[PDB]
Design a protein around this ligand. Structure first.
Ligand SMILES: CC(C)(COP(=O)(O)OP(=O)(O)OC[C@H]1O[C@@H](n2cnc3c(N)ncnc32)[C@H](O)[C@@H]1OP(=O)(O)O)[C@@H](O)C(=O)NCCC(=O)NCCS
Ligand SMILES: CC(C)(COP(=O)(O)OP(=O)(O)OC[C@H]1O[C@@H](n2cnc3c(N)ncnc32)[C@H](O)[C@@H]1OP(=O)(O)O)[C@@H](O)C(=O)NCCC(=O)NCCS
Lengths: 157, 157
């Protein structure tokens, strides 16, 4: 009934902090292959911001991303919608809003290492297994993950 | 292999933030009758401290308490051991160490509102149902918890 999108960050007021915990809680529930401590580390890392999906006070989704304005792309880390609220298009809205945030900041590229079970969702948001940014841009900067496949998205206007 | 006891709180240290979150996760998994956001609120509250049990870098247990020096007791909010590690004398250790901390701080009585299933566990730690510290001392200072049983016990030097 009321639904909000906030880019948040630990760079730490009381409200966002509740949201930061809520995001960590949402992520750890969906991403079973991610240890809670690791999520907490990245989520609270000041070089990472998280785009939070609030519904009626409560965090229900988010995308954790790290921007590399120098490389000309953004690494997408932990994106999740809570189980209740899956398949209602929330995840596509988050990616859309993420996409618009970045057009303003003039980063036109997304990179992520995709779980096997969610390659489907990224392909819908325009990601491809075939990457158009040269290796020399992201190798080293971006976290490689075990048996996740790397996908890119090249936004526009 | 390494096992630590730290008394923590929100009174921006990067270590204790991760610990406080790690504590919120453990408290949240183990106590269904308490909503995640409530736990977050109290855990990070500057009048609440928490006894963290770290194991090899990671929180596996804790006791959140609020000290009432002006009263003569300490109120026990949450305590829990992560599930891997239950039935290993870990929570007995935590409570023992909590007792020491408070003796060293001149607060002899512990109060808790105990939930239907851990009455067993508190009873062993000297805890009981009959309080010896006057109702007027704690009522309205402590937080009544619904269909929990109030309990209390004293600790020697
Ligand atoms: C993946 C996820 C973030 C998608 O959010 P969502 O709101 O549930 O999915 P949506 O409602 O936005 O639907 C998105 C589209 O991708 C599709 N899709 C393909 N594979 C999918 C998958 N594995 N999960 C969800 N949607 C998927 C949906 O059917 C939908 O297609 P359509 O609208 O064209 O018909 C969410 O389901 C989730 O939290 N999964 C668990 C954790 C995870 O796998 N994270 C990694 C990637 S974010
Ligand atoms: C109850 C709890 C906090 C204790 O941690 P623990 O390490 O498993 O308990 P211990 O290993 O120290 O065992 C303590 C003694 O109390 C007993 N006990 C009573 N209830 C128990 C319970 N629910 N779980 C484990 N032990 C329990 C044990 O048998 C043990 O007896 P013994 O040493 O004489 O053989 C833990 O199981 C937990 O987190 N439960 C979920 C949430 C909860 O009940 N919190 C209550 C407030 S602390």
């Amino acid at each position: 009934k009321v639904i909000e999108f906030h880019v948040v960050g630990n760079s730490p007021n009381k409200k966002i902090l509740m949201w930061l915990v809520g995001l960590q809680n949402v992520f750890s529930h969906q991403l079973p292959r991610m240890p809670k401590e690791y999520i907490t580390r990245l989520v609270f890392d000041p070089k990472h911001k998280t785009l939070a999906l609030i519904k009626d006070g409560r965090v229900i989704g988010g995308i954790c991303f790290r921007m590399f304005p120098s490389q000309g792309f953004t690494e997408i880390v932990f994106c999740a919608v809570t189980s209740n609220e899956q398949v209602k298009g929330y995840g596509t809205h988050l990616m859309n809003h993420l996409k618009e945030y970045h057009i303003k900041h003039d980063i036109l590229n997304f990179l992520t290492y995709a779980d096997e079970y969610a390659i489907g969702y990224f392909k819908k948001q325009g990601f491809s297994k075939e990457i158009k940014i040269p290796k020399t841009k992201y190798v080293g900067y971006i976290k490689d993950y075990e048996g996740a496949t790397l996908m890119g998205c090249e936004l526009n206007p």
